């Protein structure tokens, strides 16, 4: 839904997928992209539960 990046896999977050890691490179960028993804998940939780 809202958390999904338009071109992602819709349910999983794979570090090997360029659209999922916001065009990251090596290790720091991809893991920070994961951090941003979990931030988006928390925000979606806040929207859902209220």
């Amino acid at each position: 839904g809202m958390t999904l990046t338009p071109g992602s896999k819709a349910g999983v977050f794979d570090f090997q997928d360029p659209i999922d890691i916001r065009g990251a490179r090596w290790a720091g960028e991809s893991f920070k992209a994961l951090l941003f993804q979990i931030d988006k998940e928390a925000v979606e939780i806040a929207r859902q539960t209220g």
């Binding site: 360029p18 659209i19 065009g23 490179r25």
Partner: protein
């Protein structure tokens, strides 16, 4: 199926690497972006558009790929060394 027209001389240097029958040239981000854009509308980058802004570098890349079967070309956006097979399609990593 055609050969690229020769734009005079002054070709950028290609470093021969007999270690793996390879070579190395530093193109940058503009050449790779141009090649990726060319191989997105159905065009060709090896020989088409012989009057491009950076066609000389593309002709040098074509000559390098013909002479060396496992070329190692390094861009500048990520400095990745894309091989001849990866450069054949014209799509490097991402983006439309």
């Amino acid at each position: 199926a055609k050969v690229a027209p020769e734009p005079e001389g002054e070709l950028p240097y290609v470093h021969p690497l007999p270690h793996r029958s390879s070579a190395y040239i530093w193109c940058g981000w503009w050449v790779m972006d141009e090649i990726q854009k060319m191989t997105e509308e159905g065009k060709d980058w090896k020989t088409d558009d012989p009057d491009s802004k950076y066609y000389l570098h593309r002709y040098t890349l074509q000559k390098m790929m013909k002479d060396y079967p496992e070329v190692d070309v390094q861009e500048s956006r990520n400095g990745y060394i894309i091989h001849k097979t990866a450069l054949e399609t014209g799509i490097i990593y991402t983006y439309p």
